[PDB]
Amino acid sequence: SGSSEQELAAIVRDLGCGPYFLGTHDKRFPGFLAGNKLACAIVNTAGRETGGVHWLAFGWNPRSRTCYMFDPFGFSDRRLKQIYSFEYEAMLRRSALALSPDRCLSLEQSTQTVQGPDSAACGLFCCMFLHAFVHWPDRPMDGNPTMNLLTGVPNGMLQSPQVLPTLRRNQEKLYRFLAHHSPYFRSHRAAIEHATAFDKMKQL
Amino acid sequence: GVKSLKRRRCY
Ligand SMILES: *[C@@H](CNC(=O)CNC(=O)[C@@H](NC(=O)[C@@H](NCC)c1cc(Cl)cc(Cl)c1)C(C)(C)C)CS(C)(=O)=O
């Protein structure tokens, strides 16, 4: 069920997030406190001691002073809080104080799901955004060569039959994606595509 | 890719 910290840590490095990548964190990722450098990370929604539940991606652009929060489902902070017991306020607090002069910062995020409700490709997508972020961090969410391959759909439409032919089609091209760029992906591809399948959560 | 919403926060 899903991708493990090592899996993600290895793939994120195949996708070149290397120079910019701050590791994998439980729900208590500090923020971007270090210096004003293009940084990014992977933060689990849950605390390490649950075993770990959902993967999130987080990015910092210098120019724009913008935290990108990326949930492959585009759940709102309010929904993420409700489903996953997750909030990242004091996260942005530390960050915007650590890094911004006026102590202000922009929070940019999806309203739009790329994942199927049942899928467990949650890190693999997070990894895909972390490739788009580390090459076009000014426009990471859409209109770059990495997300132009993917098709966002209104979050609120998630539990709907109309969407899934597109939500499967993101998940094929997400595999095409990683296969193309990650040596570790190809190496583990079969067990990865099996453990993160479209319908894993009813293949449990 | 995905639509998004940018929210200017301050602290
Ligand atoms: C998508 C499917 N969910 C996941 O891929 C979440 N995966 C996990 O939680 C990992 N867990 C780990 O890697 C934990 N490490 C074991 C030694 C772990 C690592 C870190 Cl850095 C942080 C935490 Cl909190 C836990 C497993 C092995 C697959 C459980 C989410 S969904 C189903 O789409 O809502």
Side-chain angles (χ1 to χ4, degrees), chain A residues 11 14 175 178-179 182-189 192-193:
Chain A
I11 299 172
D14 296 318
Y175 287 151
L178 293 204
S182 154
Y184 189 106
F185 185 53
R186 299 166 313 235
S187 298
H188 297 65
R189 183 157 180 200
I192 276 186
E193 292 197 14

Side-chain angles (χ1 to χ4, degrees), chain A residues 130-147:
Chain A
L130 277 196
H131 180 271
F133 162 78
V134 302
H135 307 58
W136 309 272
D138 290 18
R139 25 161 194 155
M141 301 267 167
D142 209 308
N144 63 246
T146 289
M147 288 314 274

Side-chain angles (χ1 to χ4, degrees), chain A residues 17-62 64 66-171:
Chain A
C17 304
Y20 308 121
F21 186 63
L22 278 140
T24 92
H25 295 70
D26 66 341
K27 68 173 180 197
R28 306 160 198 104
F29 175 57
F32 302 105
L33 326 143
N36 214 260
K37 320 199 294 64
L38 202 71
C40 58
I42 286 175
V43 183
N44 206 82
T45 55
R48 210 165 263 260
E49 71 285 293
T50 58
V53 163
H54 169 50
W55 288 123
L56 281 185
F58 268 99
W60 177 260
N61 183 26
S64 59
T66 312
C67 197
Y68 296 99
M69 182 290 283
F70 180 81
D71 166 25
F73 301 128
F75 280 137
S76 54
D77 316 62
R78 206 159 181 199
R79 279 284 271 178
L80 298 156
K81 184 46 189 295
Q82 175 191 205
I83 302 147
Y84 293 121
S85 314
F86 184 67
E87 56 154 67
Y88 61 115
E89 290 285 350
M91 187 265 210
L92 287 165
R93 194 146 225 148
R94 298 198 287 273
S95 286
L97 305 177
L99 292 185
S100 89
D102 52 4
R103 302 155 44 126
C104 303
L105 76 41
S106 303
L107 204 257
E108 179 166 351
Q109 103 211 268
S110 231
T111 58
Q112 276 198 337
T113 173
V114 270
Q115 192 155 333
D118 285 311
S119 181
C122 63
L124 314 189
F125 279 129
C126 279
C127 295
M128 212 181 150
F129 174 82
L130 277 196
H131 180 271
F133 162 78
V134 302
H135 307 58
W136 309 272
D138 290 18
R139 25 161 194 155
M141 301 267 167
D142 209 308
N144 63 246
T146 289
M147 288 314 274
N148 278 355
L149 309 180
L150 298 197
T151 293
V153 301
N155 178 77
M157 287 187 200
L158 186 85
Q159 351 274 201
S160 204
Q162 256 95 353
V163 288
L164 335 183
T166 292
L167 298 179
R168 180 182 298 278
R169 192 163 48 80
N170 291 331
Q171 205 157 163

